[PDB]
From a paper:
The cellular glycoprotein LGALS3BP (galectin 3 binding protein, also known as 90K) is a secreted antiviral protein that has been identified by us and others to interfere with late steps of human immunodeficiency virus type 1 (HIV-1) biogenesis, resulting in poor infectivity of released virions. 90K is composed of a scavenger receptor cysteine rich-like domain of known structure, a BTB (broad-complex, tramtrack, and bric-à-brac)/POZ (poxvirus and zinc finger) domain, an IVR (intervening region) domain, and a C-terminal part without substantial homology to known protein domains. The resulting atomic models revealed tightly intertwined homodimers with the canonical BTB/POZ homodimer fold, consisting of both α-helices and β-sheets. As expected from the sequence alignment, the two BTB/POZ domains are structurally conserved, with a DALI score of 22.6 and root mean square deviations (RMSD) of <0.6 Å for pairwise comparisons of 119 structurally equivalent Cα atoms.
Among primate 90K proteins, rhesus macaque 90K is unique in its inability to diminish the particle infectivity of the tested HIV-1 strain and in its low potency against SIVmac and SIVsmm strains, despite 89-to-97% amino acid identity with active primate 90K proteins. A minimal version of 90K from rhesus macaques, expressing solely domains 2 and 3 [rhe 90K(127–408)] was inactive, whereas its human counterpart showed strong antiviral activity. Interestingly, introduction of V142A, but not L268V, into the short version of rhesus macaque 90K-myc resulted in a gain of antiviral activity that was in the same range as the short human version, and coincided with reduced gp120 incorporation. Since the individual BTB/POZ domains of both the human and rhesus macaque 90K proteins do not feature a similar oligomerization tendency, and given that a single amino acid exchange in the BTB/POZ domain of the short version of rhesus macaque 90K was sufficient to restore antiviral activity, we determined the structures of the individual BTB/POZ domains from the human and rhesus macaque 90K proteins. We expressed modified 90K BTB/POZ domains that contained three additional residues at the N terminus (aa 124 to 250; based on secondary structure predictions and comparisons with available structures of other BTB/POZ domains) in Drosophila melanogaster S2 cells and purified both proteins, which behaved as a single oligomeric species in solution, to homogeneity. We obtained crystals of the human protein that diffracted to 2.1 Å (crystallographic statistics are listed in Table 1) and crystals of the rhesus macaque protein diffracting to 3.3 Å. The human 90K BTB/POZ domain structure was subsequently used as a search model to determine the structure of the rhesus macaque ortholog by the molecular replacement method. The human and rhesus macaque structures contained 1 and 3 homodimers per asymmetric unit, respectively.
Author numbering:
A (entry chain A): 129 to 247
B (entry chain B): 127 to 254
The structure:
């Protein structure tokens, strides 16, 4: 007889909130838009290296990664990076075009396959 | 705005986080398990994962810190599964371990585990 306790349902948002806080980072993500560095974010190598979707972000702790995105796709970058942590993403008609561009350019094969089927 | 398509691959996360602890690589916390004074067994933690869990409140320390855990000689085999529970957020408890797992949770602020173990003996009050 073995009685199991499971509180693992929270883990999707638990990991998502680690990215939201932007504290204890060991990776710097710069978002260059129209030449100049428009936005900035940070990552946690320990969480990122565990996900095959975040293969583009599999770098040495302390490395600076430069993300070049279209001016149209600037609001969809935060959700895209959070998807590597949370492993959950909500896609609408207006964002399926931009999310497919990001997944193709940054090796998020599962997301790329999902966006392609939504057309 | 009327149609939203959601992708969810978050089911893996219980074991994904559990395997991070299993590997014992890329640690930024040293956990020394002492039994009757002298050091018996050693482990390592990841502050980023541990600080996210309220159960691991005892392990909420600066990256690089050395944490000492003073446990009973009987509760030594339950130490590895107790620390993994902070990562995986899942634990398998038996009749022989429910006594030890309640001692660990009470002494190291794992309130959810302490509450679960206490409710279990109302069921295990009998032999089998």
């Amino acid at each position: 007889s073995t009685h199991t306790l499971d509180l693992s349902r929270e883990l999707s948002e638990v990991l998502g909130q680690i990215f939201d806080s932007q504290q204890g980072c060991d990776l710097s993500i710069s978002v260059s838009v129209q030449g100049e560095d428009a936005l900035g974010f940070c990552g946690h190598t320990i969480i990122l290296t565990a996900n095959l979707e975040a293969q583009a972000l599999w770098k040495e702790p302390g490395s600076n990664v430069t993300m070049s995105v279209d001016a149209e796709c600037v609001p969809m970058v935060r959700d895209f990076l959070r998807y590597f942590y949370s492993r959950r993403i909500d896609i609408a008609l207006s964002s399926v075009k931009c999310f497919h561009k990001l997944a193709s350019a940054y090796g998020a094969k599962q997301l790329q396959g999902y966006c392609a089927s939504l057309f």
